[PDB]
Design a protein around this ligand. Structure first.
Ligand SMILES: [Cl-]
Length: 170
């Protein structure tokens, strides 16, 4: 029982807290592809895309996934890791995938909270909201497609780990 465990979902849904705790209960080491990328490709998307394009950003992400995926590890992934099929296929072939689920409506509400004081209706408000929800829902369908297991990540982290330990049988 030694395969890495991949955590997928949006960031801000307790991947770090759940990941570390889970690692602690199994004697595994916790790692995070986004930190790996900051360390090896720098702190900005802008520098990588300017130098190597979106395809070179995706390549560095895919290499980070493959580099940290060794036995006895719980791997947190970037919110966009599931966007390319090759990453989804890699994850399923090399270990167990847990989706920390948060409804696309809640993610939209989190974006609003961080960016706008409230929400008075405006002519352009719903259309733009609608576009952002469509993109959130397309990504959600890919989180679901790659997952072996899905846990409600709108629960506190301790309740998630316990359900995963039951769900995955530990
Ligand atoms: Cl994200």
């Amino acid at each position: 029982m030694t395969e890495p465990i991949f955590m997928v979902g949006a960031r801000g849904c307790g991947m770090t807290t759940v990941g570390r705790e889970l690692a602690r209960a199994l004697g595994y080491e916790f790692v995070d592809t986004d930190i790996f990328m900051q360390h090896t490709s720098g702190m900005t998307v802008a520098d990588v895309v300017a130098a190597e394009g979106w395809p070179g950003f995706r390549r560095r992400e895919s290499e980070a996934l493959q580099a940290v995926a060794t036995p006895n590890r719980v791997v947190a992934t970037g919110g966009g890791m599931v966007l390319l099929e090759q990453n989804r296929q890699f994850m399923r072939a090399h270990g167990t995938v847990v989706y920390l689920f948060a409804p696309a409506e809640e993610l939209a509400l989190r974006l609003q909270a961080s960016l706008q004081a409230h929400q008075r209706p405006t002519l352009t408000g719903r259309p733009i909201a609608e576009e952002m929800e469509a993109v959130l829902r397309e990504r959600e369908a890919l989180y679901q497609d790659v997952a072996h297991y899905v846990v409600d990540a709108t629960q506190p982290p301790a309740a998630i780990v316990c359900e995963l330990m039951q769900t995955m049988r530990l």
